[PDB]
Amino acid sequence: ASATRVIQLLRNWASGRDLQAKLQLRYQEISKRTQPPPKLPVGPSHKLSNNYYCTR
Amino acid sequence: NVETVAVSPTICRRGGAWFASFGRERNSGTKLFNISGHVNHPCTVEEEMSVPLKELIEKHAGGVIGGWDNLLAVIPGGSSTPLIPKSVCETVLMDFDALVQAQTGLGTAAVIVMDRSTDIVKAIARLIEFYKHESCGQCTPCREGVDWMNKVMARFVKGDARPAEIDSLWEISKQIEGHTICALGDGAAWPVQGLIRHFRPELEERMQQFALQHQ
């Protein structure tokens, strides 16, 4: 937040707690909107043998 | 078979007991043997039934090429019978029951030998390709599964697969064996089973070599 120090002091005194530590407006601290590709592992029954369906 | 009817009149003429003298109980008689592959003198010969394989090769066939220590594997009863290694063929008899004890069976008494200077995977793949060519294909297991096994062996020969597939191939054979109409499916499943059971390390090493060289 680009708020002047006097306004920050006024708001902190009025609320009684330090507002600048935990702001309710989201900033560059959030995750990027473009992400690497995932891999998403397979399940446990993706075996090639000893995987007869009558047993599961 | 030709041999059965051919020996029947001589059995009748000389008596049943004379034929029953040779071989063991429930394995009586004399048998025609073909010895082929890596031997000094490949030949056909009539011999007493329960003759040990080693003396049969060393006597009539002239011995394995390069000596007995050069031997790698032997198929005792033709392509249908599974192969066996040197360790069990050192002291094995040649009849139905003793070969069943070696998990193979006598079959047609067609001995095919392979020394240590050959690709056993290539030979078994050739046998599976032959079975793929010679199946009539009326029933789904033999037709589809034998083509599948032929493809899997062709892929094994160059090591293009991964070890987790080997067990899969085993399973495929068990699906063909006993579910077809005739015994051609059994005779195509057995060689793969024997090759896997006795030389899984060879297949694994070939796969590792392929994976390393192709990266």
Ligand SMILES: Cc1cc2nc3c(=O)[nH]c(=O)nc-3n(C[C@H](O)[C@H](O)[C@H](O)COP(=O)(O)O)c2cc1C
């Ligand atoms: C695919 C296949 C091919 C066969 N080819 C022959 C053959 O060429 N000669 C033969 O005597 N038996 C062959 N058999 C086995 C026959 O079933 C067998 O000859 C028949 O049962 C009578 O044989 P026997 O004289 O031992 O009673 C073959 C079996 C299969 C499944």
Ligand code: SF4
């Ligand atoms: S198992 Fe016998 S009947 Fe079935 S497809 Fe093969 S050769 Fe034909």
